[PDB]
Structure 1
Amino acid sequence: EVQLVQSGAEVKKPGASVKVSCKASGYKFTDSEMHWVRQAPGQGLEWIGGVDPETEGAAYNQKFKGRATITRDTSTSTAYLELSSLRSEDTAVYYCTRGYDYDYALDYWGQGTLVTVSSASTKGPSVFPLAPSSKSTSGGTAALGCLVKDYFPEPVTVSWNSGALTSGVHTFPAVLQSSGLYSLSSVVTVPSSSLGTQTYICNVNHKPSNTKVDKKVEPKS
């Protein structure tokens, strides 16, 4: 199976540089080009440039005005994108993607890396349970969740039971509080009948502040 695994989200000050990595596996790395595309939502998709791993040949979108440098390491099958003289406008999700053939669409894309350019202080989230109770039942179903409050910048990711629980999950888009910090909630609906036997843990990750929290959500006593 082809996989393109990128490095985690980062926050950088204006004027600084960022280097995003893209670890490739499941194919011969030197036989395909690696391109970088960014997405500033909602201003669409923009090609940054790419590298031929065999020759080191690189091409760029003129718009980046030489600020982008794309390199690779063939001994580790990894491609890199370095963007210098960062500006607020560089805040975007950066994707690495494989250029298999000129006649084929970019066929495998990394998960993306959100790079936020800001002078503001990084803040880790506080994670609170949203306990299931008599106020969160609906015809044999129960809702529970986690509230992920006061973090900066985006993103926070949330999984339930280390990815084993995916059905009925809603991880909401973040809201921007008056303070400039973000908040989000992640909920799940489960059978009310098994609240006593099942364990529900929200796994919260905020890469910029290197925060990783696992919070067990128990019925309200």
Structure 2
Amino acid sequence: QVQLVQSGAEVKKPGASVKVSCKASGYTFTDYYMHWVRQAPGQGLEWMGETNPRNGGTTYNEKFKGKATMTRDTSTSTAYMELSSLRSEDTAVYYCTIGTSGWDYFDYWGQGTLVTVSSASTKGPSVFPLAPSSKSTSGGTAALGCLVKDYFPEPVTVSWNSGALTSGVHTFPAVLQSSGLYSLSSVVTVPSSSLGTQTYICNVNHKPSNTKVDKKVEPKSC
């Protein structure tokens, strides 16, 4: 039952600080060192450092000394990584990871936290239905979805029926609009036969604006 659950996506202005967390469960927290890994487009995956949970002892990758500060709270089984003097270049996905077999491997990883550094205004998304109609059928199959428009920054996550519907779901990578806002669609194919008995709800989450939107996609009579 080993799990590493990281804090949500964040958007910060340049010069500010951010403290990302990693809640560990299903094992004795003090048994394994906690590691932090950065994934930025271009620089790729980089190991940032390791924290000894017993004493809080830290070994940093020299590149991240001063920029990153690693700490832990053994009582809450939580590891923290604080980034200071944020700049545009600090925009990346940060992962926490452990190895449960000495120093042989990283077998468990957190889901990652996207930290975006920007002076632009945070904007929650507008969520529109992509209703199934005679125009969105393909021999017994109906396509439907949600259009998630005009948000900033990334990421938005989309689930269907509170995570109960995952088969045939395609949540497209976001596009950058000329306005500087993002847009994406999440679609799903289902049987056209049961549009009258099944309910399809997309759950759009936009953690940087603290927004959660549930949109029921109703079949269209066209």
TM-score range, shorter chain: over 0.9
1:189 & 1:211 partners in 2: Cα distance?
A: 26
Deviation at 1:40, TM superposition (A): 0.7
1:95 & 1:220 partners in 2: Cα distance?
A: 42
Deviation at 1:142, TM superposition (A): 0.2
Deviation at 1:42, TM superposition (A): 4.4
| Structure 2 match to 1:33 | 33
Deviation at 1:207, TM superposition (A): 0.3
Deviation at 1:55, TM superposition (A): 1.7
Alignment of 1:107-122 (within 5 A): 107-122=107-122
Deviation at 1:103, TM superposition (A): 2.0
If the length of structure 1 is used for normalisation, what is the TM-score?
0.97
Deviation at 1:65, TM superposition (A): 3.5
Deviation at 1:178, TM superposition (A): 0.2
- Determine helix, strand or coil for the equivalent of 2:20: strand
1:197 & 1:31 partners in 2: Cα distance?
A: 50
| Structure 1 match to 2:69 | 69
User: Is 1:103 aligned to residue 104 of structure 2?
Assistant: yes
TM-superposition CA deviations, 1:83-115 (whole Å, max 9, x none)? 10111000000000013xx123x1100000000
Structure 2: gaps (5+ residues): none
1:170 & 1:195 partners in 2: Cα distance?
A: 19
Q: How many residues align?
A: 218
- Determine helix, strand or coil for the equivalent of 1:198: coil
Runs of 4+ in structure 1 displaced over 2 angstroms?
none
Fraction of identical pairs, as percent: 91
TM-superposition CA deviations, 1:145-204 (whole Å, max 9, x none)? 000000000000000001110000000000000000000000000000000000000000
Deviation at 1:210, TM superposition (A): 0.6
2:79 & 2:14 partners in 1: Cα distance?
A: 24
TM-superposition CA deviations, 1:46-91 (whole Å, max 9, x none)? 1111201012110111112312110000101000000101110000
- Determine helix, strand or coil for the equivalent of 1:89: helix
1:43 & 1:35 partners in 2: Cα distance?
A: 18
- Determine helix, strand or coil for the equivalent of 1:135: helix
2:41 & 2:27 partners in 1: Cα distance?
A: 31
Higher mean C-alpha deviation, range 42-51 or range 87-96 = 42-51
2:57 & 2:86 partners in 1: Cα distance?
A: 24
Please tell me the root mean square deviation across aligned C-alpha atoms, in Å. Answer: 0.8
- Determine helix, strand or coil for the equivalent of 2:30: helix
1:90 & 1:220 partners in 2: Cα distance?
A: 45
Higher mean C-alpha deviation, range 55-64 or range 133-142 = 55-64
Structure 1: gaps (5+ residues): none
If the length of structure 2 is used for normalisation, what is the TM-score?
0.97
